[PDB]
Amino acid sequence: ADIIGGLAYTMGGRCSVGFAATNASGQPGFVTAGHCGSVGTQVSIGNGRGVFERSVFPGNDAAFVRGTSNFTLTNLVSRYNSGGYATVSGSSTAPIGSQVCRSGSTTGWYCGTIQARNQTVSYPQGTVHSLTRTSVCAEPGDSGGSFISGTQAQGVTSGGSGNCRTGGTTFYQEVNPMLNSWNLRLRT
């Protein structure tokens, strides 16, 4: 199964792929939101199978799913309704005010603006800090999805308010803290 940002995967519910990445051992997988699965949780995506190797939620909302079978990495992110794909060439942080787009398996591809960083939000399960707020909408299922600016990966969908029918606000977990802390390499 091709690991592409924004695609759906299941684990006793549905979430979306953040970004294809490899761990310190060179094993293929992808970063996503930690609320999508506890450590040890099994994942299915197409004919692919994986497991949550790393996961932290609440506090943070980050996770890395390691492929155990049929994981083919790509440096792509699906643009669904807008067609085609965005390419990932790195993860240079975009400035506040920059445009940013989100890819999720429920609503698809929506874009907005990076409004503020270092945000703390309260979810039913607890508080999550260090998040980045954007004017993009999101709906259940989009969780873990890619937030990308141009060709630079920014983060993974954590949560928010509203919906994509009337609009809303969506926060994301920065990608670099995951790549750094867990010694991961983004597929480019």
Automatic annotation (TrEMBL):
Disulfide bonds join 15-36, 101-111, 137-164. The active site is at 35 (charge relay system), 61 (charge relay system), 143 (charge relay system). It comes from the Bacteria. Residues 29-181 form the Peptidase S1 domain. Belongs to the peptidase S1 family. This is Serine protease. The chain holds residues 197 to 384 of 384 of the full protein.
